[PDB]
Structure 1
């Protein structure tokens, strides 16, 4: 007998209210959903995990002094081109980037991992535009 490999299935859409949740600990679960490792027919070389919609990403929560002390970084290729941005400011300007960077780092590197990240839809504010897909509310 050879191991079961699934034919393509309809992917599940899914909703998560990020409000008051701890950045990293939420991130971990979103990644799992994304990889689809909650599914007994999990297959490592195809995209068969869920689509994950997140709302209230601006109301993510963080412990210690990471608001002032956590630094996001960007190198431009140019001399002196390392930009440093604190959590506080990232939230004040692009709050969904906070959760986006977090999940992205916990996805695999490579062509598949990048596809999985595209299946993450993160939103600041309580609304999202995907009522069409009718995502299923998740408690995490």
Structure 2
């Protein structure tokens, strides 16, 4: 037999913030952390990724001319219920949302996928209003 298999170990926490960085190019690695894909326990059915706190949201670089040009969308189940809101207005109010939306899209879509999106804590900052560890990666 070879079930290499884990046993439950203590979950790690992490702080990060490439406030000066291209999102997507950020959000990609975040997700790879939220799944245990960096560590060789990796087990696809279980949830042993890192908890992740990202300080100083907003501030993020976005390439090209993506203001007014990147448009975000919500439909209520109603007649003419489409909403179209551009990037500018999302940073202007609810910038914690921007980096959130971007990671969601890179996470699998099952129940376990929603469980990992809960492991991801985002604050336009700095100051992450919870202290009990955070081995900062740069």
Normalised TM-score (structure 2): 0.95
Aligned residue runs from structure 1 range 66-77, under 5 A? 66-77=66-77
Distance in 1, Cα, partners of 2:101 & 2:6: 31
- TM-score when scaled to structure 1? 0.94
Q: Give the number of the structure whose residues are more often helix, by fraction.
A: 1
Residues 74-129 of structure 1 show CA distances to partners (whole Å, capped at 9, x for unaligned) of: 11111111111111100000001000000000000010000000000000011111
- How far apart are the structure 2 equivalents of 1:135 and 1:128? 13
Note the 1:92-131 alignment, pairs <5 A.
92-131=92-131
9-18 or 46-55, which deviates more: 9-18
Q: Which runs of 5+ in 1 are unaligned?
A: none
Runs of 4+ aligned residues of structure 1 deviating over 3 Å after TM superposition are: 133-138
State how many pairs are aligned. 138
How big is the shift at 1:18? 2.8
1:35-69: CA deviation from partner (whole Å, max 9, x where unpaired): 11001110000010000100111111100111221
CA contact (8 A) 1:18 1:26 kept: yes
Q: CA deviation at 1:132?
A: 2.2
Q: Tell me the equivalent position of 2:31.
A: 31
Corresponding residue of 1:61: 61
Q: How far off is 1:135 after superposition?
A: 4.8
Contact 1:53 1:135 in 2 (8 A): no
* 8 A Cα contact 1:35 1:48, kept in partner: yes
